[PDB]
Structure 1
């Protein structure tokens, strides 16, 4: 079943948009459950201009799936907008299958960007980290838990500005080694301890994951816990306080951030607003 995991701790027709003003383009990414393509929206917004957007849609398998896409539409529509989230822009719930229109981020996902860049400056890596912390500060102010914070789940748009989102619809998580077949598909290398043992998720759980994400950014995109398998010995490791060593490109204070994010006690971790402030230095 398709499903996003943004959890807050029905539809406003003001978002509706005619699909006849929606001109499909190239497929950006396809999972088994649906796909996201790029398009052009004529008359979408106050400006009634032409903006290039991205449309999430399901395949042909229905209908508790259609329902999931709707629920995602409603959550996004409630959280409100923010300069560092991939924003809802509109939708098509009539005259055909549900289309969820969102912002198009031209430079693609952060992880790939980092990897074909192994030129960036350390000031760029700082901009990415800060921008994402600001998007995450926003989510938690809305009492929203992301539950899948990772570099793959950050996009870069104009001016290489970072926007966080959930893009599980457009890739194959069922066949992705970073997501474990526990049953649910869980990104265990990014998950805080309490999420792995007590199935507890909170805003501070996200902070942990943002720590691992920091590590991805300043290691220019290595897989976390390099050469270490997900299994019983692994759970004992992170439970016992094991932490990844400082990335080559990380400054000393940035690695301070990660270590704080990886506090074993959830309440010892910094909040996203605290993080945002130390990042602006």
Structure 2
């Protein structure tokens, strides 16, 4: 769904410098769009203290959006302005909230999404896959430290920028959810194959829930982009399987130790799942290549 700050975990949750001239923005092609929003590539002139002309990403609402939509965009803006910067996050760089529609300026990731990258690379080395894994875990450990839940951890939501470095961000407003069959209609469109059981059955969303999803992301990375639960449709049988403890088989390119992380992330009991900080350390130790 969308990023959100929750109460207590790990740390402690206690709670217009970003304004940029929209005329100093030169819009380019649209990168993606959803039911009520879209993100476009653009060039910003004189942005930041370095007065760069760098290429950036600009998120904005569509004509079909109303108050509720506008608030969600402002809320994301507010969350990003509060989180602070991190190397593996699609960082906020500015915003245009006056003199026209609200625009949120973030870093642009030239290589696009990790899922498509893996599919066109089926060269990639085992070391590269481990790096992708570590960078996302670093970003997730960062969010966890700010009591921020992601709720849509998946390879399609990991972007690659200069140096093929992975970054995560809230792409919900530009995600084409209505036409993506991976988002299952539920009353709501949810990425069921990536969701933890408690999120599916109890509608509970916590950092541990994102850990489960991170395990599914690992399976996507080490299978070089296969759709999770291959050939299995989302329905009663699927839900019964996951609830009953079913887990996907080890991916073709995952070393046993990496598969062990997936299994840990998929522990049915949320408190039996590792933390993102523990995952980072294990990956740091390499565990396996």
TM over 0.5: yes
More moved, 38-47 vs 93-102:
38-47
1:127 and 1:173 map into 2 onto residues whose CA distance is 28
2:209 and 2:280 map into 1 onto residues whose CA distance is 17
Q: CA shift at 1:248, angstroms?
A: 0.3
Q: CA shift at 1:32, angstroms?
A: 2.8
1:163 and 1:66 map into 2 onto residues whose CA distance is 25
Q: CA shift at 1:172, angstroms?
A: 1.6
1:64 and 1:163 map into 2 onto residues whose CA distance is 27
Q: CA shift at 1:66, angstroms?
A: 1.2
- Consecutive unaligned residues of structure 2, counting only runs of 5 or more, are 7-13
Listed one character per residue, the Cα deviations across residues 201-226 of structure 1 (whole Å, up to 9, x for unaligned) are 11000000000000000000000000
- Consecutive unaligned residues of structure 1, counting only runs of 5 or more, are none
1:222 and 1:20 map into 2 onto residues whose CA distance is 43
**Superposition TM-score, scaled by structure 1 size:** 0.96
Residue in structure 1 matched with residue 11 of structure 2 by the alignment: none
Listed one character per residue, the Cα deviations across residues 213-247 of structure 1 (whole Å, up to 9, x for unaligned) are 00000000000000111111111111111100000
Q: CA shift at 1:166, angstroms?
A: 2.3
Listed one character per residue, the Cα deviations across residues 115-159 of structure 1 (whole Å, up to 9, x for unaligned) are 011110000000000000000000000001101100000000000
- Classify the secondary structure of the residue corresponding to 1:32: coil
Residue in structure 1 matched with residue 258 of structure 2 by the alignment: 254
Report the RMSD for the aligned CA atoms in angstroms: 1.8
Q: CA shift at 1:26, angstroms?
A: 1.4
2:35 and 2:5 map into 1 onto residues whose CA distance is 26
Q: 2:111·2:159 contact (CA, 8 Å) conserved in 1?
A: yes
More moved, 76-85 vs 31-40:
31-40
Q: 2:35·2:64 contact (CA, 8 Å) conserved in 1?
A: no
2:123 and 2:101 map into 1 onto residues whose CA distance is 42
Q: CA shift at 1:33, angstroms?
A: 1.5
Q: CA shift at 1:41, angstroms?
A: 1.0
2:231 and 2:52 map into 1 onto residues whose CA distance is 50
Listed one character per residue, the Cα deviations across residues 145-182 of structure 1 (whole Å, up to 9, x for unaligned) are 10110000000000000001122322320121111111
Q: CA shift at 1:76, angstroms?
A: 1.1
1:53 and 1:113 map into 2 onto residues whose CA distance is 20
Q: CA shift at 1:35, angstroms?
A: 1.3
Corresponding position: 1:129 with 2:133:
yes
Residue in structure 1 matched with residue 55 of structure 2 by the alignment: 52
Q: Aligned match of 1:91 in 91, 95, 106? A: 95
Q: CA shift at 1:12, angstroms?
A: 14
Q: 2:32·2:176 contact (CA, 8 Å) conserved in 1?
A: no
Q: CA shift at 1:79, angstroms?
A: 1.1
2:106 and 2:21 map into 1 onto residues whose CA distance is 15
Q: CA shift at 1:277, angstroms?
A: 0.4
Q: CA shift at 1:61, angstroms?
A: 2.3
Q: 2:60·2:104 contact (CA, 8 Å) conserved in 1?
A: yes
- Classify the secondary structure of the residue corresponding to 1:277: helix
How many residues align? The count is 277
Q: 2:112·2:159 contact (CA, 8 Å) conserved in 1?
A: yes
2:240 and 2:91 map into 1 onto residues whose CA distance is 38
- Classify the secondary structure of the residue corresponding to 1:81: coil
2:267 and 2:15 map into 1 onto residues whose CA distance is 40
- Classify the secondary structure of the residue corresponding to 2:29: strand
Q: CA shift at 1:20, angstroms?
A: 1.2
Deviating 4+ runs (over 2 angstroms): 168-171
